[PDB]
Design a protein around this ligand. Structure first.
Ligand SMILES: Nc1nc2c(ncn2C[C@@H](COCCP(=O)(O)O)OCCP(=O)(O)O)c(=O)[nH]1
Ligand SMILES: Nc1nc2c(ncn2C[C@@H](COCCP(=O)(O)O)OCCP(=O)(O)O)c(=O)[nH]1
Ligand SMILES: Nc1nc2c(ncn2C[C@H](COCCP(=O)(O)O)OCCP(=O)(O)O)c(=O)[nH]1
Ligand SMILES: Nc1nc2c(ncn2C[C@H](COCCP(=O)(O)O)OCCP(=O)(O)O)c(=O)[nH]1
Ligand SMILES: [Mg+2]
Ligand SMILES: [Mg+2]
Ligand SMILES: [Mg+2]
Ligand SMILES: [Mg+2]
Ligand SMILES: [Mg+2]
Lengths: 168, 175, 180, 178
């Protein structure tokens, strides 16, 4: 056991995503454009979240993945052009907002019809900064959490729940 | 969700989740005390992006520590790598996670590509297996379902990049 | 047989090998003088695969100041394109020169110039070997132009048709019967 | 003039030594693939890994008196190689010539040769500009120069991504490594 405590249980998470699904599914239930809602996720923290979210949204949703390295270095771009598409960014953790800031700028330059953000977790300097997120799963404290996509050196991702890693 | 598009339902969400829980248990037993011996978690390798739905559910269903590795590919058995693995799988216990194995051509390339990286072991787990896979030559240790030779959609599987978000798997009607 | 690589495929030679290497030598001197300057970091040459590869090699050797190589790979989804291979390094605060083979519509250069400026380099200029008359419709300014050529489709010295004729030392108009 | 004044301690291979060797290699390669180009109907394929052999492949291709096509690969290390950019087309049944710049331990070539042969090309040979003593695993058909195990720069070869634009190959002044 390397988990200090369980922050968000698997039952809580699945219950919240079901709520997010309908909230999203009714902001996007009209179709008019003839094109499905596009979910864009950066590998690979929100992979667990986007697979559950897409199944929880009661409207047709399509998948788009991105792989980005650091020196803002694109290691795998979008498969198709998102021009005139309704795009929903699916993140796992928004803390400083730097990651979201870069991604949103990059996607907006591709000229989408709309662009909104859906993160599973939001830390407490993301609330002080008053970032603009359309959909927030949970408001968590500023402690390093793992599980449900989140990781520490590529581990604990397979956890059905979200717990806090013990500061050794 | 897709009115009139799905002709007949092949596999309900309930049945899919039940089989994966069974697969997870079986895989967990075979790789029991592998993290205690080697000191490294079981490595799940998945090709984007049809089996992403399946690998997320499977990883949670396996009672041993597992990690994720993704590959983005394209076609010219002839496969172009758009995004390679992030790490070196040398000496790692590797499980290939596929969505559907039909001709086995996709699998025969991936098996060869990964075995050239010299992993400690390499096995395959596919959710769906079609009858033509019997003519393939890559051994599959874990099979979710044996289905007939019909085009199915849902749970990751698609047709013109649609129906992926479906919670179940079903056949398609002339669309 | 003959010494000709593609007999009967070239309608007319637009530019010869020596004429090409002579202009590049001139461009090198011109570029070298502009970037003779003060920051410690070398001039950065950025070209997309794989038409201006032949050109950037000779150009970098023709420029009398230190030059570094950067390569990008892209693939159309017209003016919109995906990145198959990004820069290996961050060009922030770097003096960057876009090395292109042919500028016609300008759609290629327009996206690249806009993309490279979002990385915020110290300076960003464009050098193309060839320029067609349709390039005047674009809005991205070009500092160095080796040759202004007609609208006709040309090959050689990197330029291709179905991945052929790239290895030619000269540039010529492809015979119409090849692409018809 | 000198692009890097006071950085090169000595010249190993002058620009004309290199270009002269390339002409010899081009003629030699051209005659080996003389008759097996008009039979298949497809040109000779040059495959090169970025970025060290870019200068060498552009000069070599123009030195080969038969039609030659280009293919570039971008890689990274984690013998063990990560592909950043793969080949543009399928090389099944093609006549492939691997164009390298330097073969030392032979690990890089060992991976590439294995990777390309899995794509089932008709023929697969190797041409490197430079070869080091510890390259005595995978057969090399064409070698430009046999050089000592010292660290050299120029003509594609770099140190911290510099000195690639040199027309010659030489050794570096010890103060550069500071
Ligand atoms: N696992 C985990 N990762 C965390 C956490 N906080 C930030 N990160 C890093 C970052 C996500 O890191 C995932 C990158 P991967 O490990 O390569 O998939 O989230 C910061 C959001 P910000 O840019 O708006 O500040 C955390 O609590 N748990
Ligand atoms: N949606 C769907 N896709 C199918 C099916 N059969 C093969 N594929 C193609 C493929 C799975 O679908 C991948 C679609 P992509 O991710 O958009 O490229 O599996 C081929 C296995 P093989 O190489 O052994 O023949 C099917 O029944 N439904
Ligand atoms: N070989 C050849 N190619 C030409 C020509 N005109 C435009 N191109 C397309 C030229 C290269 O098109 C093929 C891409 P690659 O094979 O990777 O060089 O880029 C178009 C520039 P823009 O988007 O500003 O119009 C031509 O005359 N000959
Ligand atoms: N500058 C320089 N680089 C050298 C030298 N030897 C190997 N290299 C690196 C050479 C190429 O390394 C990649 C660097 P780059 O080609 O600049 O992207 O590896 C081949 C060695 P092996 O065949 O044993 O795998 C050398 O003497 N000088
Ligand atoms: Mg993330
Ligand atoms: Mg598959
Ligand atoms: Mg170009
Ligand atoms: Mg090399
Ligand atoms: Mg190097």
């Amino acid at each position: 056991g390397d988990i200090k405590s369980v922050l968000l249980t698997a039952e809580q998470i699945q219950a919240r995503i079901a709520e997010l699904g309908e909230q999203i599914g009714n902001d996007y239930r009209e179709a008019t454009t003839g094109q499905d809602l596009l979910l864009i996720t950066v590998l690979k923290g929100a992979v667990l979240f986007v697979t559950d979210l897409a199944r929880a949204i009661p409207v047709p949703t399509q998948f788009e993945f991105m792989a980005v390295s650091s020196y803002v270095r694109i290691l795998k771009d979008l498969d198709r052009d998102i021009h005139g598409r309704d795009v929903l960014i699916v993140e796992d953790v928004v803390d400083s907002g730097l990651t979201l800031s870069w991604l949103s700028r990059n996607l907006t330059s591709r000229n989408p019809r709309s662009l909104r953000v859906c993160t599973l977790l939001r830390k407490p300097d993301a609330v002080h900064a008053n970032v603009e997120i359309a959909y927030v799963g949970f408001d968590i404290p500023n402690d390093f959490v793992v599980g449900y996509g989140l990781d520490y050196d590529e581990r604990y991702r397979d956890l059905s729940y979200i717990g806090t890693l013990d500061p050794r």
